Amino acid sequence: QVQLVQSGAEVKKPGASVKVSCKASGYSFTGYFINWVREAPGQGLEWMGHISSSYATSTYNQKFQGRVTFTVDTSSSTAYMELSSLRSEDTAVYYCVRSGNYEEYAMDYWGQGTLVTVSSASTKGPSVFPLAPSGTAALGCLVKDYFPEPVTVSWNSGALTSGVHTFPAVLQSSGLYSLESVVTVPSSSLGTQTYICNVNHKPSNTKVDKRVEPK
Amino acid sequence: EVQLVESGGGLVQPGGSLRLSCAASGFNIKDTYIHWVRQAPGKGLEWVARIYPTNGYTRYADSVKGRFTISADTSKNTAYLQMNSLRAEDTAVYYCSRWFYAMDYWGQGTLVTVSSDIQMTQSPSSLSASVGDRVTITCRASQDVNTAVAWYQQKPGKAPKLLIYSASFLYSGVPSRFSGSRSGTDFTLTISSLQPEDFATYYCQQHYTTPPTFGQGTKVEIKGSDIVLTQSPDSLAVSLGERATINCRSSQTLLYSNNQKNYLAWYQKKPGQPPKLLISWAFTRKSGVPDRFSGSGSGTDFTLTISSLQAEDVAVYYCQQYSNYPWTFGQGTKVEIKRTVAAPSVFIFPPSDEQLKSGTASVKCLLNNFYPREAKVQWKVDNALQSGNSQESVTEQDSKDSTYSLSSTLTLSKADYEKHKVYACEVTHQGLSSPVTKSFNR
């Protein structure tokens, strides 16, 4: 099958530059365009441009003209996008996607995406605080001041699934992220069953387990 | 079927060597001249060399004399370009073409990358026009070129296409709206009513003498704003199993007049997943997409239809145009499952003393498993209505019960949290006959 595999997530300071890669397999590399699409929080989908895999020449979206540069190395069937003078507004998921030149022209066969976070903040793991229990009771875990995204939150090492609500992360003035993970459980069980939220922050290789017992 | 296929291009270090091949098909090179024409990044077409296979007559350009060699094997029906001591200036896409002194057939070119005198004056360098516009490009010959002028069109990533030859003659297959004319050394290309597929770079060439010369190119671009796609509605709520409609309107037509195809696509976007193509050519369902998705429309309005919505169809749907640069997306349309009103269940969480160690207090009000989305949370401290220090997070719609959960955080400096003594959140929603307040003291 046609496949595009992108490089891993990146964290950069404002004003820095980032190079994202997109290894293509399963088709004749030179015969297609590699487009670069971006999704920034709340901005939808944006086409930054595409490069001919054969000519190595590009058409750029004039909104990024001069800040974005496309390249390809055919010897390794890889396409690169280099964004310079990074701003906080460039925090986004960047996708490479193939488009055809002969019969099919629609952008199909997307890469998995590359998260690029631009911030002054540095990579740090989360502080995990219990949200002690209040018919049905609610309890939770507050994962605070971690950078960059993301964080995974499970309950009882995956045993407890029903009634779990892990909210999307919020970007604080701090520039760090914090989210909440709550769960509804029958009040009576509070003294019988034990509840542990497992928090995993791979970007900093942090792993935390916290219990929420009644206050 | 005349065909020219270039091969052999690649990365060559400075002062390096490389051979390019041009395999001819459907005709014999013995019967004509073969040209190598190059195009440097961002620049125009540059004729580098020419050969007559029959007698091996070769003509080069002064730019490449002594560094480039052109040969041919009539037995193999192939032309060759040897390159040595290559310069940085040599990096370019090399096309092979053939001569009727017009370059009617071009290979799709091959990239050579060096990892370190009749003149034609084209006017204007750039040009902005709209579909339906009448456009005129001109090329002034630096001297007498009797009628020996051809016009070519080129789109990014593709080889030049012959449009006009001997200054007014329409190449087989070119549409009627294209014409060219001559007045002495003034040469004109003119497009009757600009079609969406005519936005490209146009090149004048004189075929009178040798070397053939090229104008620097006239880029024809969309005037004003980029093709804007506006979607309606911005958000959609329909019940499970019922039909969902999304419309997309384009600020100009996406229909190519030469092939009657709409360059419009429909994409689904779920959080955390890459965009998924659903429809291309405005009605062609991508192989593997579920039956229930369909696309219709043409010209400037298109419609995506989900015949019976499912919980796994909850996402943001985007229309997208690939007709002309820059390629653009619609603003998007959020589709969600419509269900019965569900009053939120309200909980309040005081700051953990563990968090109060940290020096800040976070009081949290949770609205669990409610529908619809509209919910107002107002914080009050000692019955003083608050404002300005609250932030809300919202979950994606739950797949099974189609509800939302909301978490509102009142953040205070631990000092101010020590100051006051009653904290409550008052929730307003369609499922609450009257606002519901939850409180705690310490």
Numbering used by the authors:
A (entry chain B): 1 to 134, 141 to 221
B (entry chain A): 1 to 99, 104 to 120, 148 to 473
Question: What do the authors say?
Answer:
Four closely related scFv–Fab fusions, termed 641, 641i, 841, and 841i, were created. For this set, the murine antibody A21 part was humanized, and we shortened the linker, connecting the two binders, to two amino acids (glycine and serine), since shorter linkers had shown superior activity. Henceforth, we reengineered the Fab interface to minimize the occurrence of these side products. We next determined the crystal structure of unliganded 841 to a resolution of 2.2 Å. This allowed us to verify that the charged residues of the designed mutations are indeed engaging in interactions and are in proximity of around 3 Å, as designed. Since a two amino acid linker of GS can only span at most about 4 Å and the HER2 ECD had been proven rigid, intramolecular binding can be excluded. Interestingly, 641 and 841 treatment decreased mobility within the cell membrane drastically; however, these scFv–Fab fusions did not induce a complete immobilization despite their high antiproliferative effect and the induction of apoptosis. When lowering the target density, 841 showed the most pronounced decrease in crosslinking rates, while the mAb combination and 441 were still able to maintain interlinking at lowest ligand densities. Nevertheless, the scFv–Fab constructs were already superior to the clinically used mAb combination TZB and PZB and induced apoptosis, regardless of incomplete HER2 lockdown.
